[PDB]
Subunit: 122 residues, 8 copies
């Protein structure tokens, strides 16, 4: 999925996952302590929470297929995980895009240890 | 603490002290002679005045901790100075955030002949 | 003169006073306390000093004329002030051009805690 | 000719003649008093002198044609005037392009009353 | 009094009269034909109409003095023309500032022959 | 007309054809293969389609006149083409304006592998 | 290899594929129609031709490994395709580097009517 | 020592260690595999090597002080470690400033897993 997630993101945002979103805020690129800095950071917390609903999968290595149809990303259905994993990544990509309006260049590289809130729950 | 103030600013105003505020107007990042240029500048003058009520502390260097509850910055209490230095910084970060609407980038490189009035009283 | 000087700057350095020099370091555009930041800043300190040798003139507001011959500035001499003022300006523009090799853009918005030392003597 | 010359210019430099060259330096867009500020301002003086040798014609207005064979300007031979005005324009567009490495954005808008030099000899 | 107007303008807008306003739109820096390109342009048409209520004087030349005061330009009252002229100038400067939020960088240099509208009536 | 269109674009969108629209999407400033990128791009496709209904005209070179009521563009009549070509341009110019809210500066330098869809059918 | 190629571009040129090359001229990032704008573009054309001698492969997607030894790129050999694809990439990366001396940023957003010539011969 | 080194950095280069050098090239912020990407990157390697000559100390953590006289860093000698460490930090700070002429913003964030060279031997 790392490959698929990356593709979806440059595609939906115009920004290369690395470094625009790999360490943005408190949750983009991983993280469990916030609170979130902004909406973009929220998209990331949601994404993680999403992956957490797929313990029977390997969201990072699971390769899958997806197509575009009238602007929307269409997830394949060959297998359960591929579909669900794709849906997680599809959602975060669309969310990042819908939130590009408040994307903050200076939040792109945010020191993880600055996030000291309690561990998020989902 | 100058370090903690920097976080508050980054997190609150959404800008990084350097270069957004280290040279803003007659008082941001330093300065004693006015008159202040705008609301933002005045935030810094007030900040400067707040520090003058802590002659028994070292606001620039005394390191302190803070937390974020309900989106609000909550100052620690291990020592009165840390508490007091922290409250000064919180106010300036919030005052800067409140006045982003009149933030003028040019005051970040103002004419060198501008801050030549007489020292402001607190 | 302030007008004639700017055009000198413009023709000699290729840069417009604003925002290239009106706020450079501790002395360009104004300032009494250093220490100067670099060769460029020192050109302006020397310019400040040069002006101080003309208490019988109005360096900043007494207009004058000058020509260019063989690519060099040639000051007029209708009045003595006009001549001496013009010489001061010609000198700074030449020093500015000459030091373009160390022109630092960041000194255009240096930290507000710099330039707070002794007043330089001419 | 305003058109052909116009065409050649953006084609060679990539800058829209107006407002990029119509008032650059002392000689772009017209001017007899210098001295030139840089190489670009000199391409425009060379241009003017090339038109000065067409009392044979109306170089500013006369219309003509030219081709782009192997990335270059080839003038037509329809009539002497047409052919000789095209060579004036071809020469200045190439000249300007060749000197783009010293084109100064702050010379783009240069007031001609700053050009005190005596009328330029060819 | 092109001096007073010039000063008022950088002071109020941060922009050098030349070249940021000397040829902006259809009316900045002269013009009887619009329509105005925008708010900024409308400030200028206003200014020139103001000057038209002064056949009584010579707006572009009668020198005068003003006081900045508490952020509000304050005109002098030695002569009528100096007061009337100064008021027309102040108004255009405050108008430009107030409309900096729509100042268009590519309207800065706008060819006058593109303004075909009828002769503007005040 | 290409000139007349450009003026229309500057007046209506507040953006200069170059580099704002000369390279936008798969159709602005040229292109036949889609699929169009966004609303701005479809304006151009439509525009290009509008030109196909004028096979007996030379829309790119045929010069025409037009006025401006208050803000509306009014096309001349001298000939059938000038009116028809002009209406085509007024159309795009107005379309480009109405869709500024989704104008994507990145589509100005979009991926070189993006316009391989099928030749669009008007 | 698109991923490996990009990393070679970053390494060899110091520019990221986006947006420095993904839309450069008629061939970088894609395109089959010239004429090629310059040397840099021509590197891409040669690359495209290089990719064509690999119909038995999936140059764009077959991932490979490589090392940097004494300043040089050293391709892998696990399979023939991986070796050949890598050699194609290495040569363009180096080629792109070798021509940084004529890199033109405007070719990053060239006119949309600029690459509709003949399909180039390999 | 993260304080001393951090301070030396901004002071010498004007760039905030984080995020401008905390992950630059293959060696900034730590790392043992290259090869180095450029001049800047080598400074860090040389810095890592310097620390390696101090196994009897704790260079990354050990605190110490320094002074700035006439623009140079002056290390203290309270203990040997503090002196040796400080000279390491100073060296890298100077090295960085000295090579800002090639600082590449595309290298500010370089994926460390892209550095596959053999473990550097100082």
């Amino acid at each position: 999925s790392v490959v698929e997630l990356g593709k979806m993101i440059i595609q939906e945002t115009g920004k290369s996952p690395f470094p625009s979103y790999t360490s943005y805020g408190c949750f983009c690129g991983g993280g469990e302590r916030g609170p979130p800095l902004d909406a973009t950071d929220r998209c990331c917390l949601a994404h993680s929470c999403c992956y957490d609903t797929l313990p029977d999968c390997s969201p990072k290595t699971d390769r899958y297929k997806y197509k575009r149809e009238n602007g929307e990303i269409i997830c394949e259905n060959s297998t359960s995980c591929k579909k669900r994993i794709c849906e997680c990544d599809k959602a975060v990509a669309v969310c990042l895009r819908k939130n590009l309006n408040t994307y903050n260049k200076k939040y792109t590289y945010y020191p993880n240890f600055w996030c000291k809130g309690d561990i998020e729950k989902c």
